[PDB]
Amino acid sequence: SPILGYWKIKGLVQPTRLLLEYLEEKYEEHLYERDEGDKWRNKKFELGLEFPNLPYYIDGDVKLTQSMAIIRYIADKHNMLGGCPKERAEISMLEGAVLDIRYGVSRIAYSKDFETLKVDFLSKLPEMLKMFEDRLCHKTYLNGDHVTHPDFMLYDALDVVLYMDPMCLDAFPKLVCFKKRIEAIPQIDKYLKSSKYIAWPLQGWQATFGGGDHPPKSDLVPRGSRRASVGSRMHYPGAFTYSPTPVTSGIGIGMSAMGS
């Protein structure tokens, strides 16, 4: 029996949590919360662990660690890494291209001036989110018709990003389909819906972003609300508060100029 260890947070072990789920895998995690920081420390080394750390994993003869060596290992056991050095290069490139955003936040997330480094991260994100959108043209998952580990990596990355700016995906309807498609997976459909699911925090309870015991909206910040309007409150079952509008006023119609 494998025992995945980590904190009771999304962190680095979330996507491996989504792969185990998706592969109907048997495992029992060793969750650690803020309180028991002393728990993991009087145990850390009594694990016969080569390179002590979190997330960890024990398959019996395999006392392994390192955040991403596990997810790949698990992805190895089932022939998911790659068949040839050619495509094994793709998965690692999708992997790494995902880690640029996953890590993008997890460097700026615990900083003092996250609020400022926040604007500059979202500035490169819409350029990164095109590399993944573009790649989905005629593709269920990043690598086509089958699922790969960097899929729960993109899902996780996409999930998190949607907390910084819940608008940074609109221009990307193919990435939103992608997310909605992973969630539409039974094994992933009955995990995000179980107790196992760890919906918070995003990083660590000590993270300026994705931190805390609760996920309220509280802070965050808009901008385009300092100008005119494009809202409407007519049959728009929203959720946030970005009042939509109508497509035109009926049909094409052209011409026109407006007035004020």
How far apart are alpha carbons 73 and 57 in whole angstroms?
10
Residue-wise DSSP of 189-256: HTTTTSSS-----SS-TT-TTT-SSS---SS----GGGS------SS---SSS-----SSSSS-----
Q: Is 41 annotated as a binding residue?
A: yes
Domains and CATH numbers, the chain: 1-80+186-212 (3.40.30.10), 81-185 (1.20.1050.10), 213-260 (4.10.770.10)
Q: Is 117 annotated as a binding residue?
A: no
Q: Is 6 annotated as a binding residue?
A: yes
Q: Is 256 annotated as a binding residue?
A: no
Exposure of 172 in the CB half-sphere (CA atoms within 13 A): 24
Q: Is 143 annotated as a binding residue?
A: no
Resolution in A: 2.7
How far apart are alpha carbons 211 and 205 in whole angstroms?
4
Q: Is 1 annotated as a binding residue?
A: no
Q: Is 205 annotated as a binding residue?
A: no
Q: Is 197 annotated as a binding residue?
A: no
Cβ-based neighbours of 119, under 8 Å, separated by 6 or more: none
CA distances (Å), origin 19, targets 14, 24, 221, 254: 9, 9, 33, 50
Residue-wise DSSP of 166-181: TTTTTT-TTHHHHHHH
Q: Give the 3-state secondary structure of residue 132.
A: helix
Q: Is 54 annotated as a binding residue?
A: yes
Query: In this structure, are strands 57-58 and 30-32 parallel, antiparallel, or unpaired?
Result: unpaired
Q: What are phi and psi of 120, to 5 degrees?
A: -80, -15
Residue with tokens 């390179």: 51
Q: Is 249 annotated as a binding residue?
A: no
Do 25 and 52 touch, CB atoms closer than 8 A?
no
Cβ-based neighbours of 181, under 8 Å, separated by 6 or more: 140, 141
Tokens of 27: 């495992």
